[model samples]
Target: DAKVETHEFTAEISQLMSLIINTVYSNKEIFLRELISNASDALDKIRYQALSDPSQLESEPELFIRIIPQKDQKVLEIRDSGIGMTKADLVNNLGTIAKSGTKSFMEALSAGADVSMIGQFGVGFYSLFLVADHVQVISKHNDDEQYVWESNAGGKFTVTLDETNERLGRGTMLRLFLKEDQLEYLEEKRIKEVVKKHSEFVAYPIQLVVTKEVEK
Candidate 1:
């Protein structure tokens, strides 16, 4: 069983990336919506699982997602405690696009049947490239070791076994290092607006941490 793999996209896939990077999507804010939507799907999965097996609920059984911004670090992090992925999942989900599990999951959802799916179009994750220069993911699953996935906009990414962090129990934490021009995303007000507009009914709690100015 191979623990890591690298994949290259065909010319058509490259062309699609160009199109997306150049014109397909109109706003950088869409990235927040996409990530939140994905997180919502994860929460939905855990809720569904707990329905049949009440024992599956963890200590913090709340179905929700949190978006935290680190202004000084220029990083925006999204955390969820949904079902996590394995090493193979990292390769198949984050490393590659066309064959991503999200695509397959979406396909199942579109078959006129009800299925628990998060993201179907493999292109949604790429939305991060529109706003950030680098993306990092920390994920842990019950059946697999914790893994870290990191990448710039370049076609290649790296995955390594994560040792610093304790087991996340299950789920993912995605951090985006924003470009200078995208700094507005780091503001709590902006993040809350984006979530309310695109993910208000997301079936999970979306929290934004805000700070108040001190009076002199």
Candidate 2:
């Protein structure tokens, strides 16, 4: 627990959080669609990279996204075996606006681009705050060391080296500490139906794991 640092969401962008939370959903489960959509983009990243380099898939090669729900533990984890993030990315992308890695990805496609990625407005990430009182992002990248990022969605966040568990090997894992009344998300039935509802056509397989059972 040492090295816990605090940073506030900048005021201008802070409203981005509130606005998304209040207006972007029929209720709060839009957070699920937004999150899966972002993860799909994240997975596409490493998929494209592996086309050029073999090393990227040497460690963990499964092209699957995992959703781990723990109602009793009161935590939900969304992890992907995609291109993860470095400390700088955690700070620049999730910490500040930094246009999101998704934004930079679009810009990198300057010559022309793959518009298939479902992320839009570069603000899909803020929606996670709607259901989570706090969020922890654990990511690992081939180019840089792994790191842990956390926030209360209260306009501030923290970043620190992930000195545990040999890192993710690759990709990002999001731990959403569900709001008191948000435990309904931990229900396997709802997640299965919602994924089919919103992200069924996604390019990557969104693997849903609810408690001890798993569903594709």
Candidate 3:
């Protein structure tokens, strides 16, 4: 049997991760909004791809995100059927934040250019740390192997081949272990309010799976 290995972050990025998880984001609730926004962005990319290449059409043809809560496990999972990420994308997008032309984009924004261009950099996904003590991203890309990326709020993280029973085919699932103090986010009503407020027009369905009790 093989042991799981841990990966360390670059020295410069260590402090940055601490600051983001502890101080940068205002509230833990922002995780839902950021994840939803990322889903919307992915859907936008799929739409563009399908338009440019007719072969990219999905058989389901529906675009949506679902957030399911598991209170007993202290887990909140956001699932999206939008464009999934490749292995390179998982490394570049999740492993490192400032990579992929973000420096030049930020420079443009600082030079009085419109910051809207910075949206292309995809920094918003990092907001997951605001609420999650442990985070997991399971993704399946059309052209690449399925992988799972997991991390604590610390500077280090891991990306491993997924062995889950799920067959996403092409999408991303984000599971967050809610911090002790942030259990309110696990409520269905609260999650729906947040999603509807920030992501109603996101061009995809956002579903919230709630638990219900039935009388025997």
Model 1 per-residue lDDT tens digits across residues 1-216 = 324444554333444344334543346787887887777777777778889986666634656587888888999899888776777887776656454443444445457422212234545666676678788888876568789887765667678788765567778888899978889999877887888787767766677766577999
Scored by lDDT, the top model is: 2
Which runs in model 3 stand beyond 4 Å of their true positions? 1-6, 24-26, 100-121
Badly placed stretches (over 4 Å) of model 1 are 1-25, 100-122, 165-167, 211-216
Better of 1 and 3 by TM-score: 3
Q: Please report the TM-score between candidate 2 and the true structure.
A: 0.81
> lDDT-based ranking, best first?
2, 3, 1
- lDDT per residue (tens digit) for residues 1-216 in model 2: 547656665564565555444543345776788888778888888889899997789768887788989777789888888888888888877757544544444353344533222245566676776677778899988888778998776677898778763467888998999878778889889888778887777887777774464777
Model 1 / residue 143 / CA error / Å: 1.6
Error of 3 at 115 (Å): 16
Better of 1 and 2 by lDDT: 2
Query: Tens digit of lDDT per residue, candidate 3, span 64-124?
Result: 7888899999999988877888867777677554454445554554576443333355555
Residue 62, model 1: lDDT of: 57
